[PDB]
From Swiss-Prot, chain A:
One of its GO terms (cellular component) is peptidoglycan-based cell wall. Probable transcriptional regulator that may help mitigate the effect of oxidative stress and help mycobacteria survive inside macrophages. Binds to its own promoter region. Contains an N-terminal domain (NTD), which harbors a winged helix-turn-helix (wHTH) motif that is used for DNA binding, and a C-terminal dimerization domain (CTD). SUPFAM superfamilies: Winged helix' DNA-binding domain (SSF46785). Homodimer. InterPro entries: Tscrpt_reg_PadR_C (IPR018309), Tscrpt_reg_PadR_N (IPR005149), WH-like_DNA-bd_sf (IPR036388), WH_DNA-bd_sf (IPR036390). This is Probable transcriptional regulator Rv1176c. The keyword Transcription applies. The keyword Transcription applies. It comes from the Bacteria. GO terms for molecular function: DNA binding. The lineage of its organism: Bacteria, Bacillati, Actinomycetota, Actinomycetes, Mycobacteriales. Disulfide bonds: none annotated.
């Protein structure tokens, strides 16, 4: 439960607005829904799980508990996981999504701890890009002579190259805005 | 289900090189694993399935003083299915359709783009231009939420600024997607 990311997304939702099961889903599919693709069945299942830890109270409207608000602070401060599923690419790495959740509910949990996660993740995107940048020069040196399969592969690599750059650029925009704060 | 996403990725993979179990897993991670997170167990289970469909054929190759390796290659029927799936339009019922961060058409197009060929590129260009038209809907929407809710983002503090930054990530992704979708469309224009 504390090693997953949806309980926490819902903890953010509850932190801002204490809603119900359906009100929660409804709220989630337009607030955090643009980064997380979760179903109503998932939202409800996790809401059950959160009441099992006493993370949410039965005020029928759910409320974040003290224990749940503590977990959000804990989770936001918790650094980058080495066991995280998808390490090594901006398209597969789920940290970009987690940072967005942490960034939203940065009331519970502090900005200093998150800043370091933003700078740590950016450093990883540089390893990713530096890898892609190597495959480019060492596989697609002179990118104008490419014809069919070779060019299709280049273009695909160029999508990954863009994503890595995109991630770094956002991570920079995030890191900049968290400094002036 | 048969005609899902991973099988076609594996057809594209085996289209590039006839690989064995481990070779296919290894080379998928090296290439298509940078956009696709799939487990080796999953890769092999689809391999089994597509052999039952006769989409892939297995040949035991002779290795001296080596366990003889079983190599899978794409068959005629599988080569046909890959061509069929590249041509098949985007689903209007698929999830996360409303965001570049949430949409898997970006990934499907990448796979299609890999194993395209002279005959499939034309139909593939169709989906490129269609998906770009959707990213503009998504972008046009985010830019609306920006102007309506986050005009003058210099006087933003705390929650408001955190939310804007998050919205700023979505705008970049849509832009990024459009830029790539344009680069692909242009490179096919020759
Ligand atoms: Cl055959």
């Amino acid at each position: 439960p504390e090693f997953m990311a949806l309980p926490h997304a819902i903890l953010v939702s509850l932190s801002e607005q204490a809603s119900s099961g359906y009100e929660l889903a409804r709220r989630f599919d337009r607030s955090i829904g643009y980064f997380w693709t979760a179903t109503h069945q998932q939202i409800y299942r996790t809401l059950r799980v959160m009441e099992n830890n006493n993370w949410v109270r039965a005020t029928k409207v759910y409320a974040i508990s003290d224990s749940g608000r503590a977990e959000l602070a804990r989770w936001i401060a918790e650094p980058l996981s080495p066991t995280r599923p998808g390490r090594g690419s901006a398209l597969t790495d789920s940290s970009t999504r987690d940072i967005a959740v942490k960034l939203r509910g940065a009331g519970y949990g502090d900005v200093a701890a998150l800043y370091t996660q933003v700078t740590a993740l950016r450093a990883e995107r540089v390893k990713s890009l530096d890898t892609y940048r190597g495959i480019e020069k060492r596989t697609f040196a002179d990118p104008s002579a490419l014809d069919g399969a070779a060019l299709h592969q280049y273009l695909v690599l160029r999508g990954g190259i863009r994503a890595e750059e995109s991630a770094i650029d956002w991570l920079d925009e995030v890191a900049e805005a968290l400094q002036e704060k």
